[model samples]
Target: KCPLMVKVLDAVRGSPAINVAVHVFRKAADDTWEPFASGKTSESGELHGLTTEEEFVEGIYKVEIDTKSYWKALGISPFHEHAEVVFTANDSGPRRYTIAALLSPYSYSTTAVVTNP
Candidate 1:
């Protein structure tokens, strides 16, 4: 396997402010996830600029984003509940993964994919 890249988007419908913290984990042989990387979203509700050139391993991976903290940051009630995205990395060569999160006061959504040729 080659390098890994991940991007997270925090969409909060029409909310004025949304803060997010993202964490990446890889499943271990013991059926547990081990931390690999972590990041936070920018003011634009997006977590960009992440490269796992030498950190990621070939296996099933999971992504978790702190949504409750995001809502509290804006002084809003935690209504969207929890937000997380888990995916697999099976690329044999260099690849970029883009994960997007669409969030609102009462709902949230996310999408991820490997972008490379």
Candidate 2:
């Protein structure tokens, strides 16, 4: 299974938000956000393989989903430029993560499920 996964939904259309750009960043020791991985959601609105178990160390990570582009493509204007989820991962042990987002033209919500060792 992939260490990190992203699931984005289009709340207005009641469907998956496909082809949304996703970016991942890891916090460095010097307190800087370093680009760790990037990808786009599939037809199922899920993006995987952003990182491996070896690379997903114990640190804070930021997951950014390009919500603006998604709404623009559908001929609508969104309030939030993008949706960002910041969390600490792998503090206990290696695990799986599913970062889910429910998006609308005016608002968005983010939730995550992480596997336990």
Candidate 3:
């Protein structure tokens, strides 16, 4: 009923992108991006609390994942250092989103669905 969550993964390795730097931004009244939450991915490449524990407020939200460091540490040169995904939450309660990235570096896809608790 409250708090937004998202699952992120690395499709290239067919596993979660562990220790990836992730940032969540909420659009301000003026349509500018403002930081909402910041954290790193788990071994499973998942995250929670990308949003506040309040009713899903109508606004624009973004999930940006910085893959440069994560990939660099593995001796891989990525096409894009960061992947930014923008979405909207116009509902009245919490929301959930899932994102996965392919080996192309620039290839990122997002999808989400809901189920009753």
Candidate 4:
């Protein structure tokens, strides 16, 4: 079964050319992570989906985005030397989470959370 919705935010600042790639994974019973779905941000820095639902299981999940390669392609060194967002989905029932990040040729920040309304 699919989740109710999927949303992503491109948190990179200053790097207008940077593209955000989101990978969704679930924790397996063996304690290993498995890929669930993948999506990319638009030029406006947002991605939303309603039909691409994948049931999110409760456990440690990860969203890996490629930042260095994106900057390198522009012949510019990325602000953040290395980039990766590791988050835990420790909630039950339907959840909406937003993952945002900031990137430059020197620094970066990221956050992931489960939301309810």
Tell me the spans in candidate 4 whose CA falls farther than 4 Å from its real position. 1-18, 50-54, 79-82
Residues 25-67 of candidate 4: C-alpha lDDT, one tens digit per residue: 6678898878866776666665556224344556676666666
TM-score of each: 0.75, 0.95, 0.76, 0.69
Q: Give the TM-score (vs. native) of candidate 1.
A: 0.75
lDDT for residue 81 in candidate 1, whole number 0-100 = 56
Listing every candidate in turn, what is its Cα RMSD in Å to the true structure after a full C-alpha superposition?
Answer: 3.4, 1.0, 2.7, 3.9
- Select the stronger candidate by TM-score from 1 and 3: 3
Query: How far in Å is the alpha carbon of 10 misplaced in model 3?
Result: 2.3
Tell me the deviation in Å of residue 56 in model 2: 1.2
- lDDT of model 1 at residue 70? 72
Q: Residue-pair clashes per candidate, as listed? A: 1, 0, 0, 9
Best by lDDT: 2
Clashing pairs in 3: none
| lDDT tens readout by residue for model 1, 75-109 | 67876556767777754764666776666667776
lDDT of 3 by residue, 1-117 (tens): 235555667666777777878887888978789887788777866776555545347788887878787778877778887878787765655544445444445566666665433
- The local distance difference test score of each candidate is 0.64, 0.89, 0.69, 0.57
